[PDB]
Design an enzyme around this catalytic site. Structure first.
Site, mmCIF file in Angstrom:
data_model
loop_
_atom_site.group_PDB
_atom_site.id
_atom_site.type_symbol
_atom_site.label_atom_id
_atom_site.label_comp_id
_atom_site.label_asym_id
_atom_site.label_seq_id
_atom_site.Cartn_x
_atom_site.Cartn_y
_atom_site.Cartn_z
ATOM 1 N N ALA A 48 0.835 -1.057 0.284
ATOM 2 C CA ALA A 48 -0.475 -0.205 -0.105
ATOM 3 C C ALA A 48 0.657 1.477 -0.053
ATOM 4 O O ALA A 48 1.155 1.881 0.937
ATOM 5 C CB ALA A 48 -0.595 0.349 1.132
ATOM 6 N N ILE A 49 1.220 1.658 -1.433
ATOM 7 C CA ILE A 49 2.139 2.869 -1.393
ATOM 8 C C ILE A 49 1.434 4.070 -1.872
ATOM 9 O O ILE A 49 0.289 3.617 -3.026
ATOM 10 C CB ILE A 49 3.334 2.411 -2.286
ATOM 11 C CG1 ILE A 49 3.572 0.890 -2.085
ATOM 12 C CG2 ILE A 49 4.421 2.749 -2.487
ATOM 13 C CD1 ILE A 49 4.310 0.959 -0.965
ATOM 14 N N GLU B 257 3.829 -9.460 -13.183
ATOM 15 C CA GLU B 257 2.420 -10.421 -14.646
ATOM 16 C C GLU B 257 3.484 -10.819 -15.062
ATOM 17 O O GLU B 257 3.104 -12.050 -15.202
ATOM 18 C CB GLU B 257 1.726 -9.358 -13.912
ATOM 19 C CG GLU B 257 0.095 -10.550 -15.232
ATOM 20 C CD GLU B 257 -0.872 -9.871 -14.834
ATOM 21 O OE1 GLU B 257 -1.369 -9.820 -15.642
ATOM 22 O OE2 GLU B 257 -1.221 -10.058 -13.958
ATOM 23 N N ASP C 157 -6.003 -3.065 -3.911
ATOM 24 C CA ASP C 157 -7.311 -2.744 -3.925
ATOM 25 C C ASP C 157 -8.256 -3.439 -4.515
ATOM 26 O O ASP C 157 -8.788 -3.157 -6.026
ATOM 27 C CB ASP C 157 -7.242 -1.123 -5.711
ATOM 28 C CG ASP C 157 -6.316 -1.759 -6.281
ATOM 29 O OD1 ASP C 157 -5.756 -3.119 -6.385
ATOM 30 O OD2 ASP C 157 -6.999 -1.399 -7.296
ATOM 31 N N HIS D 255 -6.745 -15.431 -14.340
ATOM 32 C CA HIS D 255 -7.120 -14.464 -14.490
ATOM 33 C C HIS D 255 -8.328 -13.496 -15.186
ATOM 34 O O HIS D 255 -8.453 -14.555 -15.842
ATOM 35 C CB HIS D 255 -5.642 -13.689 -14.974
ATOM 36 C CG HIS D 255 -6.231 -11.804 -15.669
ATOM 37 N ND1 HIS D 255 -6.645 -11.335 -16.575
ATOM 38 C CD2 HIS D 255 -5.169 -11.305 -15.213
ATOM 39 C CE1 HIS D 255 -6.996 -9.601 -16.063
ATOM 40 N NE2 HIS D 255 -5.376 -10.114 -15.415
ATOM 41 N N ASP E 207 -13.330 -8.871 -11.235
ATOM 42 C CA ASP E 207 -13.531 -7.687 -11.185
ATOM 43 C C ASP E 207 -15.593 -7.532 -11.497
ATOM 44 O O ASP E 207 -15.792 -7.993 -13.167
ATOM 45 C CB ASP E 207 -12.955 -6.572 -12.175
ATOM 46 C CG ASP E 207 -13.257 -5.391 -11.926
ATOM 47 O OD1 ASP E 207 -15.055 -4.839 -12.021
ATOM 48 O OD2 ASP E 207 -12.398 -4.332 -12.371
HETATM 49 O O1 LIG Z 1 -0.240 -1.432 -9.757
HETATM 50 C C1 LIG Z 1 0.090 -2.817 -10.082
HETATM 51 N N1 LIG Z 1 -0.856 -3.520 -9.894
HETATM 52 C C2 LIG Z 1 -0.863 -2.735 -7.977
HETATM 53 C C3 LIG Z 1 -0.755 -2.906 -7.085
HETATM 54 O O2 LIG Z 1 0.395 -2.670 -6.991
HETATM 55 C C4 LIG Z 1 0.389 -1.719 -5.640
HETATM 56 N N2 LIG Z 1 0.782 -0.613 -5.929
HETATM 57 C C5 LIG Z 1 0.145 0.247 -6.822
HETATM 58 C C6 LIG Z 1 0.339 1.915 -6.990
HETATM 59 C C7 LIG Z 1 0.877 3.130 -6.328
HETATM 60 O O3 LIG Z 1 0.325 3.950 -6.332
HETATM 61 N N3 LIG Z 1 0.979 2.380 -4.831
HETATM 62 C C8 LIG Z 1 0.880 1.016 -5.385
HETATM 63 O O4 LIG Z 1 0.293 0.145 -3.499
HETATM 64 C C9 LIG Z 1 -0.986 -2.234 -4.598
HETATM 65 O O5 LIG Z 1 -0.586 -2.973 -3.723
HETATM 66 C C10 LIG Z 1 -1.958 -2.513 -6.219
HETATM 67 O O6 LIG Z 1 -2.873 -2.843 -5.287
HETATM 68 C C11 LIG Z 1 0.882 -3.494 -11.441
HETATM 69 C C12 LIG Z 1 0.025 -3.179 -12.182
HETATM 70 O O7 LIG Z 1 0.571 -3.068 -13.657
HETATM 71 N N4 LIG Z 1 2.797 -3.411 -11.373
HETATM 72 C C13 LIG Z 1 3.001 -2.000 -12.150
HETATM 73 C C14 LIG Z 1 4.214 -1.706 -11.991
HETATM 74 C C15 LIG Z 1 4.839 -0.809 -12.236
HETATM 75 C C16 LIG Z 1 5.780 0.212 -11.694
HETATM 76 C C17 LIG Z 1 6.683 0.866 -12.115
HETATM 77 C C18 LIG Z 1 6.213 1.071 -13.632
HETATM 78 C C19 LIG Z 1 5.260 0.517 -14.190
HETATM 79 C C20 LIG Z 1 4.624 0.058 -13.674
HETATM 80 N N5 LIG Z 1 4.142 -2.839 -11.636
HETATM 81 N N6 LIG Z 1 3.267 -2.973 -11.235
HETATM 82 C C1 LIG Z 2 -10.477 -10.463 -23.868
HETATM 83 C C2 LIG Z 2 -10.693 -9.784 -23.165
HETATM 84 C C3 LIG Z 2 -11.043 -7.976 -22.473
HETATM 85 C C4 LIG Z 2 -10.868 -7.993 -21.158
HETATM 86 C C5 LIG Z 2 -10.086 -8.450 -20.377
HETATM 87 C C6 LIG Z 2 -10.439 -7.376 -18.536
HETATM 88 C C7 LIG Z 2 -9.304 -7.786 -18.118
HETATM 89 C C8 LIG Z 2 -8.226 -6.657 -18.390
HETATM 90 O O1 LIG Z 2 -7.654 -6.733 -16.781
HETATM 91 C C9 LIG Z 2 -5.777 -6.311 -17.477
HETATM 92 O O2 LIG Z 2 -5.198 -7.439 -17.366
HETATM 93 C C10 LIG Z 2 -4.101 -6.768 -17.864
HETATM 94 C C11 LIG Z 2 -3.322 -8.099 -18.535
HETATM 95 O O3 LIG Z 2 -3.563 -7.776 -19.774
HETATM 96 C C12 LIG Z 2 -3.440 -6.449 -16.776
HETATM 97 O O4 LIG Z 2 -3.356 -7.891 -15.822
HETATM 98 C C13 LIG Z 2 -4.504 -5.839 -15.421
HETATM 99 O O5 LIG Z 2 -3.458 -4.988 -14.258
HETATM 100 C C14 LIG Z 2 -5.396 -5.962 -15.563
HETATM 101 O O6 LIG Z 2 -6.231 -5.073 -15.046
HETATM 102 C C15 LIG Z 2 -6.791 -5.137 -13.893
HETATM 103 O O7 LIG Z 2 -7.596 -5.812 -13.903
HETATM 104 C C16 LIG Z 2 -9.071 -6.153 -14.313
HETATM 105 C C17 LIG Z 2 -9.779 -7.266 -14.062
HETATM 106 C C18 LIG Z 2 -9.766 -4.389 -13.518
HETATM 107 O O8 LIG Z 2 -9.599 -4.460 -12.250
HETATM 108 C C19 LIG Z 2 -8.644 -3.793 -13.454
HETATM 109 O O9 LIG Z 2 -9.093 -1.812 -13.162
HETATM 110 C C20 LIG Z 2 -7.132 -4.171 -13.078
HETATM 111 O O10 LIG Z 2 -6.101 -2.974 -13.385
#
Ligand SMILES: O=C(NC[C@H]1O[C@@H](n2ccc(=O)[nH]c2=O)[C@H](O)[C@@H]1O)[C@@H](CO)n1cc(-c2ccccc2)nn1
Ligand SMILES: CCCCCCCCO[C@@H]1O[C@H](CO)[C@H](O)[C@H](O)[C@H]1O[C@@H]1O[C@@H](C)[C@@H](O)[C@@H](O)[C@@H]1O
Length: 277
Positions: free
Chosen positions: A58-59, A235, A145, A165, A258
């Protein structure tokens, strides 16, 4: 030894689900409602005095999600078992004071975009080698989240698990959003892949999670040295790792959903862990 238990006899000539795959081709269970008797599993895991760690980051503004996350985890996550929450944050004073049930505790762990991208895998690996090995049996690593809406219990526990997923469980492998550039360590060709696993929910034994997270971290640093960032960041690397090191259970999208984006399909009897809208 289990005690005497009274429950319905499993019927060999009646499938548990007729609408979904409940075992992978490497004989890992795929966990859906109707595949498990939670009373038997709770017995098995309580008799081992199992402790489950739950890690969450949680950043910055994401500290706002902690209250609902933790309150709902108290209602639905491993209830009856020992739980240790690990909250990784840049704002320890912003962690809400959530009332915990008996046998459950919470630790607050204070924490270039390239380093931010590798942060979760790096820190989970570092803390596996320290606190987690001594404190918990299993680690569950999730996005913050989110909220729990139904049971998430010991049915998930196994040496190594990934979660289907929610966007791609019905997709063909060519449509999976794997990293497709051969220059990346996360590269998966169009004719490979079992599933698209979600980065928002994985786990296993501390030893296996340490291995996964160290491997993903090391692969990400190789990519950084080569000037490439995988399409879906850690991922993409998680998916490469689980292709080459098959998980011992796979969780259905009941465990990562979702509802705003995808509704509530008939194939999901329960929505257990869901995105906050
Ligand atoms: O943010 C991501 N996932 C969501 C989780 O990551 C954590 N998060 C994300 C953004 C933020 O501002 N603070 C935080 O805690 C939190 O636990 C969220 O539930 C994934 C989505 O692709 N992510 C983004 C990145 C990323 C990091 C740096 C540059 C570009 C992408 N790495 N992982
Ligand atoms: C073909 C059907 C087309 C429809 C596909 C809909 C899901 C897309 O999902 C995104 O998938 C990405 C990888 O491809 C990453 O995992 C991303 O974090 C995710 O978004 C996350 O999870 C989602 C469930 C949402 O909660 C979104 O807000 C999140 O950021």
């Amino acid at each position: 030894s289990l005690p005497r238990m009274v429950y319905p006899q499993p019927k060999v000539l009646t499938p548990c689900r007729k609408d979904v795959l409940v075992v992978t081709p490497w004989l890992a269970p795929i966990v859906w409602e109707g595949t498990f008797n939670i009373d038997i599993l709770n017995e098995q895991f309580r008799l081992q005095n199992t402790t489950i760690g739950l890690t969450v980051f949680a950043i910055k503004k994401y500290v706002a999600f902690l209250k609902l996350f933790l309150e709902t985890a108290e209602k639905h996550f491993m209830v009856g078992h020992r739980v240790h929450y690990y909250v990784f944050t840049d704002q320890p004073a912003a962690v809400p004071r959530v009332t915990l049930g008996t046998g459950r505790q919470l630790s607050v762990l204070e924490v270039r975009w390239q380093d931010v991208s590798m942060r979760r895998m790096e820190m989970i690996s570092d803390f596996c080698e320290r606190r987690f090995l001594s404190e918990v049996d299993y680690l569950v690593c999730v996005d913050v989240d989110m909220e729990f809406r139904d049971h998430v219990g010991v049915e998930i526990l196994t040496p190594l698990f990934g979660t289907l997923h929610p966007g791609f469980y019905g997709s063909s492998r060519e449509a999976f959003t794997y990293e497709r550039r051969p220059q990346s360590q996360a590269y998966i060709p169009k004719d490979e892949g079992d599933f698209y696993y979600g980065g928002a929910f994985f786990g296993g034994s501390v030893q296996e999670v340490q291995r996964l997270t160290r491997a993903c971290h090391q692969a990400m640093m190789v990519d950084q040295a080569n000037g490439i960032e995988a399409v879906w960041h850690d991922e993409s690397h998680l998916n490469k790792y689980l292709l080459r090191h098959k998980p011992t259970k796979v969780l259905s999208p009941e465990y990562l959903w979702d509802q705003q984006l995808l509704g509530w399909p008939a194939v999901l009897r329960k929505l257990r862990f869901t995105a906050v809208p």
